[PDB]
Amino acid sequence: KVDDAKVSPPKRAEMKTSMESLIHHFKLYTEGYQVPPGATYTAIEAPKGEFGVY
Amino acid sequence: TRPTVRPRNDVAHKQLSAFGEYVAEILPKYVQQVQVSCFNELEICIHPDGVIPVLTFLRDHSNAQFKSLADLTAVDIPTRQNRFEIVYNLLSLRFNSRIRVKTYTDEL
Amino acid sequence: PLMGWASTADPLSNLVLTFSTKEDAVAFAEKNGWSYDVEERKVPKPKSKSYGANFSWNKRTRVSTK
Amino acid sequence: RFRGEHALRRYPSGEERCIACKLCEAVCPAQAITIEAEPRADGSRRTTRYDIDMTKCIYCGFCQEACPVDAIVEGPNFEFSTETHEELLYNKEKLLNNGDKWEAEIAANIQADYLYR
Amino acid sequence: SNLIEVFVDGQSVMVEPGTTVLQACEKVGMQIPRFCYHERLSVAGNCRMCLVEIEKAPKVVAACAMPVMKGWNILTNSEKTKKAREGVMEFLLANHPLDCPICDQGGECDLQDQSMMFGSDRSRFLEGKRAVEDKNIGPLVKTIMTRCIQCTRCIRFASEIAGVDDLGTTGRGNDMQVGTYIEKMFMSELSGNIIDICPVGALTSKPYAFTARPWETRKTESIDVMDAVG
Amino acid sequence: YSTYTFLDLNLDLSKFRMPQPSSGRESP
Amino acid sequence: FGSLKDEDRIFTNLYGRHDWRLKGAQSRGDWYKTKEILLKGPDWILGEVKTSGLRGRGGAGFPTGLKWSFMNKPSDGRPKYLVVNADEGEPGTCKDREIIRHDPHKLVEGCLVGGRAMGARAAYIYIRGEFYNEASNLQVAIREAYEAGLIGKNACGSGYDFDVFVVRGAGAYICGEETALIESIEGKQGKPRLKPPFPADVGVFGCPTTVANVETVAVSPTICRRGGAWFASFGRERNSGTKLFNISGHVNNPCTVEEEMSVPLKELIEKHAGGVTGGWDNLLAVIPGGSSTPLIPKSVCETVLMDFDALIQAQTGLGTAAVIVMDRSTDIVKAIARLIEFYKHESCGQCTPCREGVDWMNKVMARFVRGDARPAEIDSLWEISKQIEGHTICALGDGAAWPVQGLIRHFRPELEERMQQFAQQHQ
Amino acid sequence: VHRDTPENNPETPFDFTPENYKRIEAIVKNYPEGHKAAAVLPVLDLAQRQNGWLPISAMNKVAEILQVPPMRVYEVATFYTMYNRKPVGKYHIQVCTTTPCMLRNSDSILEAIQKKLGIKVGETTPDKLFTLIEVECLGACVNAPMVQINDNYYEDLTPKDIEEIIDELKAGKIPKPGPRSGRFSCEPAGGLTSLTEPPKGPGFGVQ
Ligand SMILES: Cc1cc2nc3c(=O)[nH]c(=O)nc-3n(C[C@H](O)[C@H](O)[C@H](O)COP(=O)(O)O)c2cc1C
Ligand code: SF4
Ligand code: SF4
Ligand code: SF4
Ligand code: SF4
Ligand code: SF4
Ligand code: FES
Ligand code: FES
């Protein structure tokens, strides 16, 4: 997982001892992340063509 | 800053800065805003009268081919006094670059 | 009447739009043409607060138990 | 780690491991779960109604991993195929029966696999 | 006439001679993290969670309670502010139980809507967590004083508006509780209104207590008719 | 060297002369 | 500095220890020129202490000649008071209960003289309740002179003559800081204010006051009397005068000590009279102050004099003037860990930096004394000490970082060998 | 320990002596009126002097004297250390342990009190009156680990004093309120004399 924990959830053996882990396990499951504004586009090589997201 | 943070480069941030500088210099009848996206992409705002020519300028040229239309889309936006947002998107197959054409509009 | 699910008609029932201002608020209820009623924005008193006024010689604001 | 029929575990000698903390219902993408709690008379809070559709259930594994107290578990038995749509709606007191028909099956699975997650 | 031109974040704004850094920075549209400060109460400095790094100074001050002198450079986002907010709000989240499955302010509490946005990323304690005991006040206010960030906001309520002077601050150091020392019940009009004031899940509602989490309700404004003023 | 006998300290001669008090008011 | 002295003589600012401690007739030193001193105006005394520039013996700089003249509003409509400390809160100080032991007549000499500079109305002195026999003789020492018509309410010869009102705390906190004393002089719980509201000579009891120490006002008669061209006697041009010391810890005679500015501690601590531990080839690990100063090994501090900037040339200066050592038998980590244990039992409890930051450390400082599992917690324990400076209100936040922050310095194999022993024992 | 009252004696009662009421007159005369309003630090401590340990009914009494709310008094009595709410003994002994007193050989003035006495450490005696606590920060660490009593202090401690002060108070003697040995006047001992004289020409105040 990405380490900085505002994006990944923590381990199950981590949200069960410490205090700072629930507040980022609970609230990362009531609401989601917070992502900055602005559009984007990308493309990968899907095995028949592309696959793009705007 | 650290690991797990995206490394940028100033190469494409300077070239795509410098390239589309003169797409507003040589057609200043239609292009009314150009801004550079921080992730090395280009947006160019175009009055809806210039829907055909600024494509047609791009469509064939020696310096900017952009011969593949990847994605035409459309976004609606209330509170804009002109609702929608038509967004064109093109691909320079000779050059490996992207530019988006954002033309506002209305219903009628 | 099989579970207790609060089922319904009234197909609008879940629509919030976010407008930027009053000037472009009412400019959408007319273009589609339905009635409306407008509330007001309320911003509070400015106001006058000053720590250090909690200790007086003859005034009444003097706090304790802190 | 297979996904399948649902269950609700309980502690050594029974406590109905659920605590109605309302997370397994907030990350169902398909809005299947329907919980309505009440302060039970002893003082500890529990559910009253618990409802899982087995048709809107898109089989994520998002209930299985959102739970803090480790209760609701996607149990490893694909035995299904009832004949009426009136039946696949689950109540609370189906799931416990369906969750105590085995726990020798489930607790052999989770002890093998909790070390990764 | 009668104002000081003070520069917030390198941008001018004109405030009265005698406001705070809190209100002046709230004029250009910023919210410093607040705990020990509600508007309709008095002002205390006992949590130290607004820490602005004022420019051209070695020290760090509280923006809750200080005047604003001749035009400073109120520098909110720096590399010394953000080392303080992250450091204060690891302290109080140590001596604290591990609820939010069952604590009833699981939707709004401000140890939770700070600690994603401001504040730290992980914990280092790693064992401890003192545990005081609860009691009763009335059949309106469920009281779990384990939770208790000890912000002294409910206590300044009673000495203020609801003039029953009943609550206090009892103890020294880490060993202190909040509630009434004798077993006196605290009940008047406006007695159940403290459960909005209480910024964490210590004071919570008795009849509502265990029914529903607050991201599901449908807020529709209305006016109540049991009384004269509405 | 005496646990009691504080009236020798407190109110023996410090009651005759306080002095005065006037001490202001501050009612409040 | 001059000639590296700081001697000890009989021409001092103290009267005498063994001569007579009871009431008396104020033989030679006390009440020598009584009414002629306060016959002049305040500006004769305002700035008169600049001949010394007496820094103040409370535990900081900010010279006491400056706080009385400057930062002193003239008048609006409200009275003024004086608050003289007498509480000794730094452990092993003993600078008080020796001034009150044998020379109590000197404190009322400059009480009325010092209050003329401010023009205050009454005088509130504050003694710890625990010192009860000495404070009992203090009120007796009032009636010896004050009752005899020498002071108050117009005595002598001036319209300015007033009283001294003695109070007691119980077990309080307000030693180490002001603005908790002017709160505990009221009746509230003594959980202190912010120190700059409007600081202590703007918002006070009901009306602005001053806060001074015992020998901040006990030297004020004779410093206005002897003055000079003597008030700069020893040390450099930074500090000037003579200050009271004390010798504690390991000594043949731990005793009271009197000297002047900037004496080297190698010849000062060994003198008066025995240095019974290892004077050399043992450790002789020394602490400069009472509690606001961390450890120093046998390095340059023995060559360093007792100037204010001499210890500020080192990592930490101190104004408590208390000397404690531990050469051979004492464990280094064991002694200072019971000084962090001290702060848990005095601290106020208002601010979340101090409360629940000290107890973060006191739980884990007791682990290091034991000797336990894996290190690199030390730098984490160093960071927390680096994280209480401007966060708390009073100095006890700042007075709790410093015995940690210097123990982590100066001393590499402190617990790197101790935790190795338990790591070897568990192995 | 805890700081709460599970209703031992709500009405004990504890009223004052008519000798004590006239001493309340002198304290109120000191403070300026209006902001006088709290003389609670000598007034509540005078109630400790009559009783010895003050119950909850004593705390309710002084509120009616000074017209304060009662919670203003329950608060203040539970902050300061010297006040006592649990029952106490006749001789409340204090062994002043700190860092320099630890360095000044508190180790033998530690236990071997219990080998001398026969009680639990830090604990009251099982019978009546010996109650042992330990305190910090009272004056001299230049002395030995000194032992304070309720009216005085015992400088220059030693196990022989442990063999004396514990022993002589069980019979009820006064074991030397001061330094039992060494210097009686706390002198530099090699700097003590310093040629006692009048202080070298008073009269520099010409200026
Ligand atoms: C560690 C420490 C201990 C202190 N102990 C005392 C004390 O025991 N008694 C006292 O009056 N002031 C003590 N102070 C300082 C108080 O703040 C001081 O009395 C007050 O600021 C007045 O200082 P002044 O002497 O310049 O007037 C202490 C300060 C520190 C940092
Ligand atoms: S299993 Fe977990 S999420 Fe589901 S109701 Fe029980 S406590 Fe709440
Ligand atoms: S498997 Fe997924 S969709 Fe189905 S009930 Fe569980 S969380 Fe909801
Ligand atoms: S009830 Fe808890 S959160 Fe509210 S003011 Fe008191 S201690 Fe703070
Ligand atoms: S009060 Fe704060 S810490 Fe406690 S359960 Fe609620 S959100 Fe968590
Ligand atoms: S240092 Fe902290 S605990 Fe001590 S008085 Fe200041 S704010 Fe209170
Ligand atoms: S943050 Fe509330 S006290 Fe400063
Ligand atoms: S601290 Fe124990 S005697 Fe000074």
Query: What DSSP string runs through G413-424?
Result: TTTTTHHHHHHH
> Is the C-beta atom of G401 inside 6 A of ligand 6?
no
CB proximity list for E61: less than 8 A, separation 6 or greater: E21, E51, E52, E54, G390
CB burial of residue B63 (10 Å; 0-12, 13-18, 19+): exposed
Q: Is G53 labelled as part of a ligand binding site?
A: no
Residue G39 lies in a domain: no
Count of CB atoms within 10 A of residue G421's CB?
A: 11
- Strand pairing class (H91-95; H130-133): parallel
Closest ligand 8 atom to H138 CA: 4
Q: Coil, strand or helix: which one is G296?
A: strand
Helix (H) or strand (E) holding H121, with range, is none
CB contact under 8 A, E88 and G391: yes
Spatial CA neighbour of G92 closest among E13, D113, H100:
H100
Residue G237 lies in a domain: no
The answer on G160 and G297 residing in a single domain is no
Residue in A22, A25, A29 closest to D26 by CB: A29
CB contact under 8 A, G153 and F17: yes
- DSSP code of B28? T
Q: Coil, strand or helix: which one is G301?
A: helix
Torsion angles phi and psi, residue B91, rounded to 5: -140, 120
E43 alpha carbon, closest ligand: 7
A21: its two tokens:
């882990």
Give the CA dihedral G3, G8, G12, G18, nearest 10 degrees: 180
CB proximity list for E136: less than 8 A, separation 6 or greater: E143, E185
Spatial CA neighbour of G389 closest among E46, E84, E119, E53:
E84
Give the CA dihedral A49, A54, B4, B7, nearest 10 degrees: 90
CB contact under 8 A, D45 and E102: yes
The answer on G221 and G83 residing in a single domain is yes
CB contact under 8 A, C57 and F26: yes
- Strand pairing class (D34-39; B84-92): unpaired
- Answer for the pair H140, H155: CB distance below 8 angstroms, yes or no: yes
- DSSP code of H156? S
Task: Kindly report whether the peptide bond that precedes residue C47 is cis, defined as omega within 30 degrees of 0.
Answer: yes
CB proximity list for G245: less than 8 A, separation 6 or greater: G256, G257, G258, G259, G268, G321, G323
- Answer for the pair G207, G120: CB distance below 8 angstroms, yes or no: no
G400: its two tokens:
């709790």
**Rounded (5°) CA angle G393-G394-G399:** 125
The answer on G395 and G318 residing in a single domain is no
Say whether residue C32 is in contact with chain B using an 8 A CB cutoff: no
E134: its two tokens:
């609860």
E110 alpha carbon, closest ligand: 5
Residue G359 lies in a domain: yes
Residue G136 lies in a domain: yes
- Answer for the pair G169, G131: CB distance below 8 angstroms, yes or no: no
The answer on G213 and G269 residing in a single domain is no
SS (H, E, C) A18-51: CCCCCCCCCHHHHCCCCCCCCCCCCCEEECCEEE
| Residues D77, D57: Cα–Cα separation, whole Å | 15
| Residues H39, H44: Cα–Cα separation, whole Å | 8
D35: its two tokens:
């919980």
Which residues in chain E have Cβ-Cβ distances shorter than 8 Å to D25?
Answer: none
CB contact under 8 A, F24 and G78: yes
Say whether residue E102 is in contact with chain A using an 8 A CB cutoff: no
The answer on G290 and G360 residing in a single domain is no
Identify the CATH number of the domain in which residue G125 sits: 3.40.50.11540
Strand partners, H7: none
| Residues E173, E44: Cα–Cα separation, whole Å | 18
Which among G352, G355, G359, G385 is the best mutation to test ligand 6's pocket, defined by most ligand atoms within 8 Å of the CB?
G355
Given G273, G295, G326, the domain boundary residue is G326
Identify the CATH number of the domain in which residue G370 sits: 1.20.1440.230
CB contact under 8 A, C64 and H72: yes
Length of chain H, please? 207
The answer on G309 and G412 residing in a single domain is no
CA of D16 relative to ligand 2 center, distance in Å = 11
The answer on G143 and G272 residing in a single domain is no
| Residues D62, D28: Cα–Cα separation, whole Å | 6
The answer on G250 and G209 residing in a single domain is no
Entry resolution (Å): 7.8
Sign of the Cα pseudo-torsion (G175, G179, G185, G191, in order): negative
Give the count of domains, chain G: 3
| Residues D17, D40: Cα–Cα separation, whole Å | 14
Q: Which amino acid is at D57?
A: C
- Answer for the pair H203, G32: CB distance below 8 angstroms, yes or no: yes
Which residues in chain C have Cβ-Cβ distances shorter than 8 Å to H34?
Answer: 58
- Helices G358-370/G395-408 angle, 10° precision: 30
Q: Coil, strand or helix: which one is H131?
A: strand
For residue H194, CA distances in Å to C62, E60, E106, G254, H191 come to 55, 50, 74, 18, 6
- Answer for the pair B72, B88: CB distance below 8 angstroms, yes or no: yes
Residue G38 lies in a domain: no
Helix (H) or strand (E) holding B46, with range, is strand B41-46
Q: Both ends of chain F: CA-CA distance in Å?
A: 41
SS (H, E, C) chain E: CCCEEEEECCCEEEECCCCCHHHHHCCCCCCCCCCCCCCCCCCCCCCCCCEEEECCCCCCEECCCCCCCCCCEEECCCCCCCCCHHHHHHHCCCCCCCCCCCCCCCCCCCCCCCCCCCCCCCCCCCCCCCCCCCCCCCCCEEECCCCCCCCCCCHHHHHCCCCCCCCCCEEECCEEECCCCCCCCCCCCCCCCHHHHCCCCCEEECCCCCCCCCCCCCCCCCCCCCCCCC
Q: Is G368 labelled as part of a ligand binding site?
A: no
Domains of chain D as residue ranges with CATH = 5-116 (3.30.70.3270)
G402 alpha carbon, closest ligand: 1
Helix (H) or strand (E) holding H24, with range, is helix H18-30
> Is the C-beta atom of G271 inside 6 A of ligand 6?
no
* Experimental approach: cryo-EM
CB proximity list for C6: less than 8 A, separation 6 or greater: none
Helices marked H in B1-108: 10-19, 53-59
Say whether residue H79 is in contact with chain E using an 8 A CB cutoff: yes
Which residues in chain G have Cβ-Cβ distances shorter than 8 Å to F25?
Answer: none
Counting one residue from C and one from D, how many pairs have CB atoms under 8 Å apart?
A: 8
Torsion angles phi and psi, residue E204, rounded to 5: -140, 165
| Residues G318, G316: Cα–Cα separation, whole Å | 7
Q: Which amino acid is at G166?
A: V
CB contact under 8 A, A38 and B70: no
| Residues H169, H129: Cα–Cα separation, whole Å | 11
Strand partners, E6: E13
Closest chain G CA to residue E94: G356
CA of E164 relative to ligand 4 center, distance in Å = 17
For residue D81, CA distances in Å to D5, D78, D88 come to 12, 9, 9
Sign of the Cα pseudo-torsion (E58, E60, E66, E68, in order): positive
Say whether residue G194 is in contact with chain C using an 8 A CB cutoff: yes
Identify the CATH number of the domain in which residue G260 sits: 3.10.20.600
| Residues E33, E10: Cα–Cα separation, whole Å | 20
Query: Nearest-CA distance from C62 to chain F in Å?
Result: 10
The answer on G193 and G54 residing in a single domain is yes
The answer on G337 and G312 residing in a single domain is no
Residue G41 lies in a domain: no
Query: Nearest-CA distance from C4 to chain D in Å?
Result: 10
Q: Both ends of chain E: CA-CA distance in Å?
A: 41
Torsion angles phi and psi, residue G358, rounded to 5: -70, -40
Residue in C52, C57, C64 closest to G207 by CB: C57
CB proximity list for G77: less than 8 A, separation 6 or greater: none
SS (H, E, C) E148-212: CCCCCCCHHHHHCCCCCCCCCCEEECCEEECCCCCCCCCCCCCCCCHHHHCCCCCEEECCCCCCC
The answer on G298 and G171 residing in a single domain is no
Spatial CA neighbour of H145 closest among H92, H82, H98:
H98
Spatial CA neighbour of E57 closest among G210, G196, C50:
G196
Residue in C46, C49, C66 closest to E44 by CB: C66
Q: Determine the longest span between alpha carbons in chain B, in angstroms.
A: 51
Task: Kindly report whether the peptide bond that precedes residue E142 is cis, defined as omega within 30 degrees of 0.
Answer: no
| Residues E38, G24: Cα–Cα separation, whole Å | 60
SS (H, E, C) G85-146: ECCCCCCCCCCCCCHHHHCCHHHHHCHHHHHHHHCCCEEEEEECCCCCHHHHHHHHHHHHHC
Sign of the Cα pseudo-torsion (G363, G364, G369, G370, in order): positive
The answer on G268 and G133 residing in a single domain is no
Q: Could you tell me the residue range of the domain that residue G277 belongs to?
A: 242-326
- Answer for the pair E138, E186: CB distance below 8 angstroms, yes or no: yes
Q: Coil, strand or helix: which one is D97?
A: helix
- Answer for the pair D59, D96: CB distance below 8 angstroms, yes or no: no
Residue G144 lies in a domain: yes
Given G326, G352, G382, the domain boundary residue is G326
Strand partners, G211: G83
Given G273, G299, G326, the domain boundary residue is G326
- Answer for the pair G227, G51: CB distance below 8 angstroms, yes or no: yes
Torsion angles phi and psi, residue G168, rounded to 5: -140, 145
Strand partners, G286: G296, G325
Length of chain G, please? 427
> Is the C-beta atom of D37 inside 6 A of ligand 2?
no
Residue G214 lies in a domain: yes
| Residues E147, E111: Cα–Cα separation, whole Å | 11
Torsion angles phi and psi, residue E4, rounded to 5: -115, 125
Say whether residue H171 is in contact with chain G using an 8 A CB cutoff: no
- Answer for the pair E111, E91: CB distance below 8 angstroms, yes or no: no
CB proximity list for H1: less than 8 A, separation 6 or greater: none
| Residues E124, E126: Cα–Cα separation, whole Å | 5
